[PDB]
Design a protein around this ligand. Sequence first.
Ligand code: HEM
Length: 393
Amino acid sequence: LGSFHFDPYSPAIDADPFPSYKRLRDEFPCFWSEEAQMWILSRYSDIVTAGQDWQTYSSASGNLMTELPGRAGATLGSSDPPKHDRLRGLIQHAFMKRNLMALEEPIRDVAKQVFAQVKGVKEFDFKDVSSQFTVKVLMAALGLPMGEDALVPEHEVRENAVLMVQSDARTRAKGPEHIAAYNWMQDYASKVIAMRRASPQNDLISNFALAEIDGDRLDDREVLLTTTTLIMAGVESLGGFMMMFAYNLATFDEARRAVVANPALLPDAIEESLRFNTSAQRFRRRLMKDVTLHGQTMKEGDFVCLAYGSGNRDERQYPNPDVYDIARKPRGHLGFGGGVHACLGTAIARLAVKIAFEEFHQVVPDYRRVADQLPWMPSSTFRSPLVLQLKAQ
Ligand code: HEM
């Protein structure tokens, strides 16, 4: 009794990691967690340094806190340069050719359709609308055919996208149904990719197949794995963050009233929510050499947790860090990571959340949490409520 532990597999850390993060930063800034069997970095400046130093802190053994089964050499998140940079350059080229900000209309169309479903409703769970919106945004961006009339109906894609990002609550690892959903999605994406190769369209999948930089192109394994890992990354992170932003606005009346009255404040409020509580809380790296930090002798081959959610609450970087201040305009926050793996979806996410809440707030201009104590999702990497029950006010 009394000994300090940090267990990212613990439901206590799902629900409220922040007091433990503060003890890490203040008392144990390079902490060995016996439950995670890895070191924990918690201070903003240490996380920035480690995230930038990919030669020391490798992603090639996986970047999720709990492990990913497949082909890391074709993924961005679980690869190191130079391969990572070749892939990222080609994908960013495809993003440029499509023009991500021209997704304004399909995203706003989705938002109007989804959030109309809570018009006039006394009480609802934001998880439903936010998951629907999230998957529809990824489908519209990639070019996965939408509508229940589509050959593969939309709700079936959503069901498999939502399941494939989940993990077993007990072990926080993937189970057979999660791997089956991933393989279903790989097969589904493969059929769309073939169709877009035959007849390119104004979507991201088509631009993945067409992108070339001085004779280089993404190979067959690479267009597929790019499509599927963008679905995976987007659904897990954007869906969780949609919930975090609504949770904050429901909790902090003055912030909610301000952005509803002046929706031009939404981008700043979104950045303060990314700082205050990103959905993408904790990622891992593997040491490529021995590193001594704060008196601790980390060893080659050890794993390390970059607790982005802790660095963003570090008073050494952000004064009064536990204050939710939508006027803060935080710069350099870690809500999207940092370095060569900084979120590839940053611009899409910022646009999508902005448009979603523009339209949501026209349907429901005032709302609060129903609950004091909320249930939180079991994840060693991500954080969001399982249920975000809101009441119209
Ligand atoms: C609010 C929404 C989102 C948040 C908070 C978020 C957060 C993050 C974070 C923290 C990382 C870095 C992980 C690491 O350091 O290992 C990351 C990487 C990544 N994200 Fe996001 N993400 C969001 C939305 C998206 C979306 C919508 C997409 C796709 C459309 C996406 C695709 C990716 C990819 C592909 C990577 C890996 C990039 C690389 O390794 O070079 N994310 N995200």
